[PDB]
């Protein structure tokens with residue numbers, strides 16, 4: 001790697017790892033379209049296994065970017081439309097509060113207050129139906145944004161129904177395989193367990209637990225190499241040969257709603273570049289990112305703006321991840337760690353690195 005990339009990365013990440021006590025970390029910088037990789041520390045403390053470019057990390061909510069792109073692919077395939085009512089794909093959803101709630105509302109957290117978490121009590125398909133039938137919106141559709149697994153998770157499950165495929169099968173065949181993400185998984189195979197890092201929470205080794213809509217909302221595990229490739233694909237959709245996936249990537253970066261300085265895409269979130277760093281940094285703190293906020297509709301949605309800071313934070317109980325990229329500069333970063341450390345620290349480090357290279 002160019003010494004300039006080496007210098008800013010090490011000068012930024014070394015202090016970060018010490019201040020946050022991160023056991024292991026992998027970082028990729030995409031610079032003029034080329035990836036450069038960095039690793040530190042331990043994938044497994046107990047067995048002294050180092051983090052490598054093949055270590056799998058839990059992406060948590062960065063998984064929602066794969067869900068949003070897979071949904072965009074279904075749109076491009078003509079299988080679903082964002083302007084279609086939720087009940088078109090779940091007719092058993094007969095409760096009257098669902099009138100007027102479209103797939104767009106589900107994909108973008110604007111259904112009217114769907115909860116952040118699906119309740120642990122919810123498991124079976126009939127358990128989920130009962131949960132959404134009984135749910136009472138606090139707001140009319142399309143008026144407030146409340147970040148929610150039960151929202152985009154449902155979007156993901158419904159968006160693959162016309163394909164007839166399972167959500168995982170659709171993700172593998174329409175997103176992972178065409179993009180050569182050959183070490184990215186909803187379920188980690190036994191052959192790959194040697195590369196699966198442990199997450200660390202209060203010093204205990206943990207992996208994510210199964211839960212309703214986990215695949216759709218926080219279920220992807222991946223390597224720094226595949227995530228670099230994920231970033232490259234989202235920086236330059238036009239180089240992707242499968243037409244509907246290229247189009248679905250563009251749809252996931254369209255701007256559907258605005259709240260404050262931020263624009264909601266499908267999974268991805270976007271701000272105009274150049275950004276005020278305090279705006280994305282403080283904006284990422286859960287105090288703000290998880291709050292109920294009124295939204296302005298963007299009518300009709302703005303297509304992917306190349307002068308944007310496109311990003312997603314993501315966490316599990318034992319992992320913390322961040323992706324950000326600026327399509328206009330062919331510049332991006334992936335930060336994967338096996339500790340859940342605060343979002344603003346992630347974004348601040350990412351901004352220092354990317355601002356130095358832009």
Ligand SMILES: Cc1oc(C)c(S(=O)(=O)N[C@@H]2CCOc3ccc(F)cc32)c1C(=O)O
Nearest residue numbers: 060061116117149217218313314315316317
């Ligand atoms: C900001 C946010 O809220 C929610 C519900 C998610 S999550 O569902 O996608 N991630 C997992 C689910 C299961 O264990 C944990 C434990 C702690 C934690 F911070 C995330 C997660 C995220 C995120 O990942 O950013």
